Amino acid sequence: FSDFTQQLDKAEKDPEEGGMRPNQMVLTSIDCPTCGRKMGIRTASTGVFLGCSGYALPPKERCKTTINLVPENEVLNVLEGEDAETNALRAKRRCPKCGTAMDSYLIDPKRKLHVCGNNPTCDGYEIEEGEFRIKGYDGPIVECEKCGSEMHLKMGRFGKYMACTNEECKNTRKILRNGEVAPPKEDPVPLPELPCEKSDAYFVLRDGAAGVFLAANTFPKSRETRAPLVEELYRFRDRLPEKLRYLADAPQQDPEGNKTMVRFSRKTKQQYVSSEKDGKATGWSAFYVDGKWVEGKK
Amino acid sequence: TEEFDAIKIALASPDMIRSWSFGEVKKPETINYRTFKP
Amino acid sequence: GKALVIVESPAKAKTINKYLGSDYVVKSSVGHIRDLPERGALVNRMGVDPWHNWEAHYEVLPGKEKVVSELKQLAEKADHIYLATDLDREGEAIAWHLREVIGGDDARYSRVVFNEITKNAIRQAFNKPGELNIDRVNAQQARRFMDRVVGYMVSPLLWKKIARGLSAGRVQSVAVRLVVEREREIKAFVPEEFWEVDASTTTPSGEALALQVTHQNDKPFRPVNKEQTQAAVSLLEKARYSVLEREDKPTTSKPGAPFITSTLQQAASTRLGFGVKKTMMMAQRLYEAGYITYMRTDSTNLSQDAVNMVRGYISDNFGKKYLPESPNQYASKENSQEAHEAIRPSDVNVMAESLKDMEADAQKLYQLIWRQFVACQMTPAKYDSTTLTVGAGDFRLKARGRILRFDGWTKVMPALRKGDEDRILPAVNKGDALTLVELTPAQHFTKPPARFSEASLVKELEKRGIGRPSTYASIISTIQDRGYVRVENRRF
Ligand SMILES: [Zn+2]
Ligand SMILES: [Zn+2]
Ligand SMILES: [Zn+2]
């Protein structure tokens, strides 16, 4: 501990006193889409990314625009055997200022970027009219309904959203409690009277193609998951938007006296009610068909 | 109507059947029960 | 009354309760049961106080409540509790925690170590027992605390200087360093061009003989460009070729050691395309179904029974020429220790094809483990190696051949493919003339160091004693999730 603390304390100090160097911006000739300025190459726990020096300027002159740096993945040819790694090294550009090889990244469907291996100790950079494809980030592959391009999952200051990789389209979906993705955005209603159980939050009611679901108000942090009970809806029936009221009319309990929950029948695009015992389905369901509620075995 | 003279039969080329169809059906769905619409 | 015995692995318990029957109540802790969760907040978070003589705050794992509980009431109908965890410091510590969670009086506790499953072992277990070693326990507490301090005190520094979500650790950070150094090694690599020249010739009889040029003017032949390669071919085309020497010699091939966690992962990766995590999942299934021994081990040792069992099998299924006079010996490390044993089938008589209750991949893994275990105790493969020395002007040429005479261990573990020396050479004697047919020049380039694979990095870690069998897989994942390295085409 004595040795360790000697090192830790020294590391805590300013770089000039021998402290740990904080991350370092290395600029490059690229135009920030928000302000055109030169752009620099940056590392975060998320990966390696392209940033605009306005990040270091106070609010008045602050710029939070960022670009993701998609690397060119080395594709070693198994048929080349021992050659496969050597040719990969041959494939790389070499830095002007030093013998060190360079590693390659995509900035536009027209542009490609080379960065030295000893970055940021070495500041060599190169920019090429090279065109390849670019991904906004990575996660659950989704297809953008507005342009057919791939859509991925992204994280930020607002939790989790879903966005399309085509730079020409900003169509962004979103994550929801009990489904892969949610079309664009939808119509929510809050309830302060339903407390969460795994967390201290409160529950809110949401709608989407997935169905109608409850969710916790600190959604990115709580991420708590359940469908609403019919008796719950009946208790907050006044808050329910005009369409949703019918769900409150639905039979609250099954013939065994178990309690009922609200589910979405994807095959028929309609809400239904079902009952569970010991958390397992009772094999009973009721549906809404032409202004009436009908019930039977699943 | 069409005043045909005879009837002919043969195997179905995939391009021919695809030319018949006015679209592809890709899901097991039939009709909605909230509103009786396909 | 009834005696309560406690071991680490459930599978091992069920097996012990058998070779002991009733009268005793065997159970397992299924792991550690308890662990950790100036600035007071920092100390509360770490669970240990470096500024207060290392006072700690252990607490049952959020997933062992039942285990601990069910173990509680069982302590009632128990006369004397027998802690039977592993003899190493980790096992010793699990015993220490059990004793402090179950409470009672020291005399109510005893420490026993099980050699093997054989009754010749489970018996001697209670024969000459002892109690827990406080020194061993404190040694493990020291390691656990040092790893804690580093992770909970260095990471925050990273959050401040570099970025949030970052981590640092004794094992974690050097694994990354290894990948970083190999990366820089590759990016700085500059391929070197070199040429090779081979010559096709005819013996005085008419047989074909391929030769490689090895020397010129008595210096290793290694042209670096086409020009130099041409200057040489021009001379070789006009030269007279004659045999200098023919060295026939008996050579052997030896089987490898039975598997350990690291080597199993590497073999499964090279011969079955299995990733480290998958290999361990299949191995886990096999162990729990009683087909093989613990999948986590760093020792290639084999018990005498295991050795008699396999020799017994080799003897009935292959014959004498495959059974060595006495057991094959290996591993002489003077600092080596003894722990569990090597990974092998629990019963040599059980073939992979008879495990119809296992997935196909688990059968493939079992077959890999089986064959390695049986080949290990068989006789060497025998070959007749031939080396031909040829002279041509100022050049020296060579040809090497090999003819299999006895497969030995390769009977159970075949040569996937013929090697470069697995060929034959025509009859020719010293002084014989050779007729040149054609000369083939070949351009080549040195290649950069290979990239690490999951198993490959594990191999490097174990080589330097960095991780543990039960943590290798876990390490490979953490460095990826943390964003320090990435895997592509199964390479780091
Ligand atoms: Zn900007
Ligand atoms: Zn450079
Ligand atoms: Zn789009």
Side-chain angles (χ1 to χ4, degrees):
Chain A
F1 195 71
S2 301
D3 285 313
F4 177 69
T5 48
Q6 189 166 306
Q7 296 310 317
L8 183 54
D9 293 321
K10 186 182 60 176
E12 296 273 41
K13 307 178 86 67
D14 176 293
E16 298 168 54
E17 313 182 70
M20 181 176 276
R21 290 185 289 120
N23 51 193
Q24 34 185 171
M25 179 66 147
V26 172
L27 280 182
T28 274
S29 55
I30 291 178
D31 299 356
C32 171
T34 296
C35 69
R37 295 180 183 172
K38 295 186 182 179
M39 289 191 74
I41 291 177
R42 297 190 73 199
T43 58
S45 186
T46 306
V48 185
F49 77 98
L50 258 174
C52 174
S53 64
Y55 85 107
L57 309 168
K60 293 182 180 180
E61 331 304 348
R62 85 174 153 182
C63 174
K64 309 191 189 179
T65 310
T66 54
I67 290 177
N68 191 324
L69 274 170
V70 176
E72 176 190 9
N73 301 4
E74 293 174 22
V75 184
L76 271 56
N77 185 4
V78 181
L79 186 60
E80 286 168 41
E82 295 85 357
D83 298 346
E85 295 85 357
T86 189
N87 291 338
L89 295 174
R90 285 171 71 226
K92 294 179 186 287
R93 282 191 177 228
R94 201 156 290 264
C95 175
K97 298 189 179 192
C98 70
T100 309
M102 299 213 292
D103 184 1
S104 308
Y105 299 85
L106 284 156
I107 54 173
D108 302 299
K110 192 61 172 186
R111 287 199 306 175
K112 190 171 183 178
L113 166 67
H114 283 273
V115 182
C116 180
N118 296 336
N119 192 31
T121 303
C122 198
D123 63 5
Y125 76 101
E126 293 199 326
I127 294 161
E128 182 172 39
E129 197 181 0
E131 71 281 5
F132 294 71
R133 170 186 166 88
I134 299 179
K135 302 301 189 170
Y137 190 63
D138 197 13
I141 298 180
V142 178
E143 184 178 319
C144 172
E145 65 280 0
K146 300 192 178 185
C147 74
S149 312
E150 313 308 325
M151 163 182 285
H152 279 89
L153 177 59
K154 292 191 182 185
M155 293 188 66
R157 55 177 155 154
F158 312 122
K160 289 185 172 185
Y161 71 102
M162 190 91 68
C164 175
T165 58
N166 178 0
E167 296 190 337
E168 305 177 31
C169 143
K170 318 303 297 182
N171 177 201
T172 55
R173 314 268 306 273
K174 62 177 302 300
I175 297 301
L176 52 65
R177 156 175 290 188
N178 52 21
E180 182 79 323
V181 66
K185 40 243 62 179
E186 300 286 5
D187 304 330
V189 175
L191 311 171
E193 182 164 359
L194 286 187
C196 296
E197 297 190 329
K198 301 180 181 182
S199 68
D200 302 343
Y202 72 81
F203 286 137
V204 183
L205 184 79
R206 291 186 175 270
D207 182 21
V212 165
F213 63 94
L214 285 169
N217 71 287
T218 56
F219 184 84
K221 191 173 183 177
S222 168
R223 214 171 297 189
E224 181 166 349
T225 63
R226 77 175 187 88
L229 301 180
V230 174
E231 51 187 8
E232 297 171 350
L233 304 174
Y234 185 83
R235 178 184 185 181
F236 318 104
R237 173 186 180 102
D238 297 340
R239 305 148 164 266
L240 301 180
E242 182 168 30
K243 287 183 179 180
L244 300 188
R245 189 134 296 93
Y246 74 110
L247 302 175
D249 297 332
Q252 315 199 17
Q253 296 186 353
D254 75 8
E256 300 176 2
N258 315 303
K259 290 187 169 197
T260 67
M261 184 167 284
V262 186
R263 297 292 184 193
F264 193 83
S265 175
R266 292 178 180 206
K267 199 169 189 173
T268 54
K269 296 179 183 178
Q270 72 190 357
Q271 305 288 351
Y272 74 98
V273 306
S274 68
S275 57
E276 295 164 16
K277 187 178 179 182
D278 303 340
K280 297 183 181 181
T282 61
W284 167 96
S285 61
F287 288 72
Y288 202 50
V289 180
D290 192 19
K292 292 156 181 172
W293 276 100
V294 298
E295 68 191 339
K297 191 267 173 198
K298 185 182 178 183
Chain B
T1 55
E2 295 182 314
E3 191 48 41
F4 48 77
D5 303 359
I7 296 177
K8 182 165 174 286
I9 188 179
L11 301 173
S13 170
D15 60 2
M16 175 58 65
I17 167 60
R18 282 183 275 96
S19 75
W20 295 351
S21 183
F22 294 80
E24 191 179 356
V25 278
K26 310 174 182 179
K27 63 182 61 177
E29 283 67 343
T30 57
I31 187 177
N32 175 271
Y33 301 102
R34 292 308 316 110
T35 173
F36 300 125
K37 307 297 290 183
Chain C
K2 303 189 72 64
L4 169 59
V5 183
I6 305 175
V7 297
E8 296 148 296
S9 182
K12 190 179 295 181
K14 302 162 71 70
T15 311
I16 294 301
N17 190 67
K18 171 190 171 184
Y19 292 66
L20 148 157
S22 291
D23 181 40
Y24 298 76
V25 184
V26 183
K27 216 69 178 179
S28 70
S29 63
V30 188
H32 274 92
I33 90 179
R34 205 157 70 102
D35 188 37
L36 301 170
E38 60 179 305
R39 190 74 285 292
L42 182 271
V43 178
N44 170 241
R45 301 302 306 189
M46 295 199 296
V48 59
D49 197 330
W51 297 278
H52 284 68
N53 214 197
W54 308 90
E55 45 187 56
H57 171 60
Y58 290 104
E59 58 185 63
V60 178
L61 298 174
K64 307 289 284 299
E65 305 297 356
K66 175 197 68 177
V67 187
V68 174
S69 293
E70 68 175 67
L71 282 170
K72 291 270 55 56
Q73 72 126 296
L74 292 172
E76 267 58 58
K77 186 184 178 183
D79 174 0
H80 192 176
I81 303 176
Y82 286 71
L83 305 169
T85 54
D86 289 345
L87 58 174
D88 54 61
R89 61 167 179 276
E90 281 296 306
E92 200 64 46
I94 296 177
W96 179 74
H97 278 98
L98 290 172
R99 187 172 69 58
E100 290 203 359
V101 172
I102 295 178
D105 195 299
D106 206 302
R108 186 204 303 182
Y109 287 103
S110 184
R111 194 69 206 300
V112 300
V113 176
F114 290 104
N115 319 304
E116 288 196 302
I117 300 300
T118 309
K119 300 177 182 179
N120 186 192
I122 49 74
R123 286 177 50 181
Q124 301 180 300
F126 291 61
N127 290 174
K128 204 295 291 181
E131 53 290 78
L132 37 48
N133 190 327
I134 185 174
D135 287 340
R136 290 283 182 57
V137 172
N138 295 319
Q140 104 77 222
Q141 295 205 79
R143 178 205 65 68
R144 176 85 194 76
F145 290 171
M146 273 164 77
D147 273 321
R148 256 274 153 158
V149 169
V150 166
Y152 282 52
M153 293 187 73
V154 170
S155 295
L157 178 60
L158 296 187
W159 304 339
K160 178 163 302 181
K161 295 276 183 166
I162 306 303
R164 287 127 186 174
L166 261 46
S167 57
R170 179 181 56 81
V171 176
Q172 183 180 304
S173 304
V174 287
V176 174
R177 173 182 182 167
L178 280 171
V179 176
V180 165
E181 289 186 343
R182 179 55 56 67
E183 196 64 54
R184 282 166 173 164
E185 201 168 290
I186 292 179
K187 289 178 180 175
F189 188 78
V190 172
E192 277 183 355
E193 175 187 42
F194 61 113
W195 295 70
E196 274 175 38
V197 181
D198 293 283
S200 305
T201 66
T202 291
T203 63
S205 295
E207 314 181 69
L209 177 64
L211 303 174
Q212 161 95 123
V213 179
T214 59
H215 304 66
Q216 194 184 324
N217 313 296
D218 282 290
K219 302 295 180 300
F221 182 68
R222 190 167 194 286
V224 296
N225 62 59
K226 187 169 186 173
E227 289 67 56
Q228 287 166 40
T229 303
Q230 183 54 64
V233 168
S234 173
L235 299 173
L236 292 160
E237 212 296 310
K238 60 60 196 166
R240 283 289 181 191
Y241 298 61
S242 74
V243 175
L244 304 182
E245 196 70 5
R246 192 195 186 75
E247 173 177 45
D248 276 291
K249 61 166 183 173
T251 59
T252 65
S253 180
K254 285 184 165 54
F259 292 127
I260 52 181
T261 304
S262 69
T263 53
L264 178 59
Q265 295 180 5
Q266 177 66 74
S269 191
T270 301
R271 302 173 69 79
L272 311 184
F274 291 14
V276 171
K277 65 308 305 302
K278 175 178 186 174
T279 291
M280 295 306 287
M281 288 283 257
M282 300 297 87
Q284 186 79 222
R285 293 186 185 297
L286 295 169
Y287 165 72
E288 287 169 3
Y291 299 133
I292 65 171
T293 50
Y294 211 74
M295 335 80 256
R296 315 183 185 82
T297 177
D298 58 10
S299 175
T300 60
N301 275 301
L302 295 179
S303 72
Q304 199 182 70
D305 289 296
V307 175
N308 299 308
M309 187 194 271
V310 77
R311 289 175 61 75
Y313 181 97
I314 294 166
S315 185
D316 301 314
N317 301 289
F318 292 101
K320 293 308 297 67
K321 35 205 179 190
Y322 293 79
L323 183 62
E325 295 290 73
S326 45
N328 283 168
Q329 307 300 67
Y330 57 91
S332 61
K333 306 178 180 180
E334 294 185 359
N335 302 307
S336 64
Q337 61 178 359
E338 309 301 342
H340 297 89
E341 188 190 54
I343 306 180
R344 44 95 183 173
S346 70
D347 182 350
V348 194
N349 294 292
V350 174
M351 305 302 93
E353 298 70 19
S354 75
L355 313 183
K356 18 65 178 180
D357 56 317
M358 225 86 279
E359 315 181 5
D361 284 354
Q363 292 181 311
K364 266 78 85 64
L365 187 68
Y366 178 82
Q367 184 84 96
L368 189 65
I369 299 173
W370 190 87
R371 296 194 145 110
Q372 186 75 9
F373 171 64
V374 177
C376 148
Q377 291 297 310
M378 285 171 95
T379 52
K382 291 191 295 184
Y383 305 81
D384 278 326
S385 300
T386 301
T387 293
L388 277 175
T389 304
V390 173
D394 280 309
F395 300 76
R396 307 220 271 103
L397 298 95
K398 185 171 59 188
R400 294 147 77 161
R402 197 179 63 160
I403 180 183
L404 179 63
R405 297 291 274 183
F406 180 62
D407 46 20
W409 69 275
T410 66
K411 215 305 176 176
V412 317
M413 260 181 82
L416 292 171
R417 292 189 179 193
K418 290 183 183 178
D420 296 348
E421 291 187 357
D422 184 1
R423 293 182 183 174
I424 310 182
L425 298 183
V428 195
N429 313 99
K430 174 179 180 179
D432 278 317
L434 290 181
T435 308
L436 182 63
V437 178
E438 192 169 62
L439 292 162
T440 307
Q443 184 188 60
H444 293 295
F445 296 95
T446 58
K447 63 177 172 61
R451 286 190 167 280
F452 280 114
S453 72
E454 292 178 7
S456 179
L457 179 66
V458 163
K459 181 188 185 188
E460 191 52 53
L461 292 171
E462 190 258 39
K463 185 183 185 64
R464 302 169 171 285
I466 304 273
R468 305 254 55 242
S470 76
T471 299
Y472 300 140
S474 175
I475 293 301
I476 284 177
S477 308
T478 298
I479 62 184
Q480 284 174 271
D481 306 330
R482 201 65 75 278
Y484 294 146
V485 299
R486 73 176 204 273
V487 182
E488 183 65 13
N489 182 72
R490 308 181 70 239
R491 286 301 182 289
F492 278 96

Coordinates of all heavy atoms in Angstrom, one line a residue, chain A residues 250-274:
Chain A
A250 N -62.4 -4.2 -20.0 CA -62.1 -5.6 -20.0 C -62.3 -6.3 -18.7 O -62.1 -5.7 -17.6 CB -60.6 -5.7 -20.5
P251 N -62.6 -7.6 -18.7 CA -62.8 -8.4 -17.5 C -61.5 -8.4 -16.7 O -60.4 -8.8 -17.2 CB -63.2 -9.8 -18.0 CG -62.7 -9.9 -19.4 CD -62.7 -8.4 -19.9
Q252 N -61.6 -7.9 -15.5 CA -60.4 -7.7 -14.5 C -59.8 -9.0 -14.0 O -58.6 -9.0 -13.6 CB -60.8 -6.8 -13.4 CG -61.6 -5.6 -13.9 CD -61.6 -4.4 -12.8 OE1 -60.9 -4.4 -11.9 NE2 -62.5 -3.5 -13.0
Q253 N -60.6 -10.1 -13.8 CA -60.3 -11.3 -13.3 C -60.8 -12.5 -14.1 O -61.9 -12.3 -14.8 CB -60.7 -11.4 -11.8 CG -60.1 -10.4 -10.9 CD -60.4 -10.5 -9.4 OE1 -61.2 -11.3 -9.0 NE2 -59.8 -9.8 -8.6
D254 N -60.1 -13.6 -14.2 CA -60.5 -14.7 -14.9 C -61.5 -15.6 -14.2 O -61.9 -15.2 -13.0 CB -59.2 -15.5 -15.4 CG -58.5 -16.3 -14.3 OD1 -59.0 -16.4 -13.2 OD2 -57.4 -16.8 -14.6
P255 N -62.0 -16.7 -14.7 CA -63.0 -17.5 -14.1 C -62.5 -18.2 -12.8 O -63.3 -18.6 -11.9 CB -63.4 -18.5 -15.1 CG -63.2 -17.8 -16.4 CD -62.0 -17.0 -16.1
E256 N -61.2 -18.3 -12.6 CA -60.5 -18.9 -11.5 C -60.2 -17.9 -10.4 O -59.8 -18.2 -9.3 CB -59.2 -19.6 -11.8 CG -59.3 -20.7 -12.9 CD -57.9 -21.3 -13.3 OE1 -56.8 -20.8 -12.8 OE2 -57.8 -22.1 -14.2
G257 N -60.5 -16.6 -10.7 CA -60.3 -15.4 -9.8 C -58.8 -15.0 -9.8 O -58.4 -14.2 -9.0
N258 N -58.0 -15.4 -10.8 CA -56.7 -14.9 -11.0 C -56.8 -13.5 -11.5 O -57.8 -13.1 -12.0 CB -55.8 -15.8 -11.9 CG -55.9 -17.3 -11.6 OD1 -55.7 -17.8 -10.5 ND2 -56.2 -18.1 -12.6
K259 N -55.6 -12.8 -11.6 CA -55.6 -11.5 -12.0 C -55.1 -11.4 -13.4 O -54.5 -12.3 -14.0 CB -54.8 -10.7 -11.0 CG -55.5 -10.6 -9.6 CD -54.7 -9.6 -8.7 CE -55.5 -9.3 -7.5 NZ -54.9 -8.1 -6.8
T260 N -55.5 -10.3 -14.1 CA -55.3 -10.2 -15.6 C -54.4 -9.0 -15.9 O -54.4 -7.9 -15.3 CB -56.6 -10.1 -16.3 OG1 -57.3 -8.9 -15.9 CG2 -57.6 -11.2 -16.0
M261 N -53.7 -9.2 -17.1 CA -52.8 -8.4 -17.7 C -53.1 -8.1 -19.1 O -53.8 -8.9 -19.7 CB -51.4 -9.1 -17.5 CG -50.2 -8.3 -18.0 SD -48.7 -9.1 -17.4 CE -48.7 -8.5 -15.6
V262 N -52.5 -7.1 -19.7 CA -52.8 -6.6 -21.1 C -51.7 -6.9 -22.0 O -50.5 -6.6 -21.7 CB -53.2 -5.1 -21.0 CG1 -53.7 -4.7 -22.4 CG2 -54.4 -4.9 -20.0
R263 N -52.0 -7.6 -23.1 CA -51.0 -8.1 -24.1 C -51.4 -7.7 -25.5 O -52.6 -7.5 -25.8 CB -51.0 -9.7 -24.0 CG -50.6 -10.2 -22.6 CD -49.1 -10.0 -22.4 NE -48.6 -10.6 -21.1 CZ -47.5 -10.3 -20.5 NH1 -46.6 -9.5 -21.0 NH2 -47.1 -11.0 -19.4
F264 N -50.5 -7.7 -26.5 CA -50.7 -7.3 -27.9 C -50.6 -8.6 -28.8 O -49.6 -9.3 -28.8 CB -49.7 -6.3 -28.3 CG -50.0 -5.6 -29.7 CD1 -50.9 -4.5 -29.7 CD2 -49.5 -6.0 -30.9 CE1 -51.3 -3.9 -30.9 CE2 -49.8 -5.4 -32.1 CZ -50.7 -4.3 -32.1
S265 N -51.7 -8.9 -29.5 CA -51.8 -10.0 -30.5 C -51.2 -9.5 -31.8 O -52.0 -9.0 -32.7 CB -53.2 -10.5 -30.6 OG -53.2 -11.5 -31.6
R266 N -49.9 -9.6 -32.1 CA -49.2 -9.2 -33.3 C -49.9 -9.7 -34.6 O -50.0 -8.9 -35.6 CB -47.7 -9.5 -33.2 CG -47.1 -8.6 -32.1 CD -45.6 -8.9 -31.8 NE -45.1 -7.9 -30.7 CZ -43.9 -7.5 -30.5 NH1 -42.9 -7.6 -31.3 NH2 -43.7 -6.8 -29.4
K267 N -50.3 -10.9 -34.6 CA -51.0 -11.6 -35.8 C -52.3 -11.0 -36.2 O -52.8 -11.3 -37.3 CB -51.2 -13.1 -35.4 CG -51.4 -14.0 -36.5 CD -51.3 -15.5 -36.0 CE -51.3 -16.5 -37.1 NZ -51.0 -17.9 -36.6
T268 N -52.9 -10.2 -35.3 CA -54.2 -9.5 -35.5 C -54.2 -8.0 -35.2 O -55.3 -7.4 -35.2 CB -55.3 -10.3 -34.8 OG1 -55.0 -10.4 -33.5 CG2 -55.6 -11.7 -35.4
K269 N -53.1 -7.5 -34.8 CA -52.8 -6.1 -34.4 C -53.8 -5.5 -33.4 O -54.4 -4.5 -33.6 CB -52.7 -5.2 -35.6 CG -51.5 -5.5 -36.5 CD -51.6 -4.5 -37.7 CE -50.5 -4.8 -38.8 NZ -50.6 -3.8 -39.9
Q270 N -54.1 -6.3 -32.3 CA -55.0 -5.8 -31.3 C -54.7 -6.3 -29.9 O -54.1 -7.3 -29.6 CB -56.4 -6.4 -31.8 CG -56.6 -7.9 -31.6 CD -57.8 -8.4 -32.3 OE1 -58.6 -7.6 -32.8 NE2 -58.1 -9.7 -32.2
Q271 N -55.1 -5.4 -28.9 CA -54.9 -5.7 -27.5 C -55.9 -6.8 -27.0 O -57.0 -6.9 -27.5 CB -55.2 -4.4 -26.7 CG -54.4 -3.2 -27.1 CD -52.9 -3.2 -26.7 OE1 -52.4 -4.1 -26.0 NE2 -52.2 -2.2 -27.2
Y272 N -55.4 -7.5 -26.1 CA -56.2 -8.6 -25.4 C -55.8 -8.6 -23.9 O -54.8 -8.0 -23.5 CB -56.1 -9.9 -26.1 CG -54.8 -10.7 -26.0 CD1 -54.7 -11.7 -25.1 CD2 -53.7 -10.4 -26.8 CE1 -53.5 -12.5 -25.0 CE2 -52.5 -11.1 -26.7 CZ -52.4 -12.2 -25.8 OH -51.3 -12.9 -25.7
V273 N -56.5 -9.4 -23.1 CA -56.2 -9.5 -21.7 C -56.1 -11.0 -21.4 O -56.7 -11.8 -22.0 CB -57.3 -8.8 -20.8 CG1 -57.4 -7.3 -21.3 CG2 -58.7 -9.4 -20.9
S274 N -55.1 -11.3 -20.5 CA -54.7 -12.7 -20.2 C -54.4 -12.7 -18.7 O -54.1 -11.7 -18.1 CB -53.6 -13.1 -21.0 OG -52.4 -12.4 -20.7

